[PDB]
Amino acid sequence: WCKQSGEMCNLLDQNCCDGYCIVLVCT
């Protein structure tokens, strides 16, 4: 269950598909 790079993410518990969470959106 990955998160599209650009969806709602978390700065401590993010789970982007293969990038990182900045501010409030995965990349």
Swiss-Prot record:
Disulfide bonds join C2-C17, C9-C21, C16-C26. It comes from the Eukaryota. The keyword Disulfide bond applies. The keyword Signal applies. It is found in: Secreted. Belongs to the conotoxin O1 superfamily. This is Delta-conotoxin TxVIA. The chain holds residues 52 to 78 of 78 of the full protein.
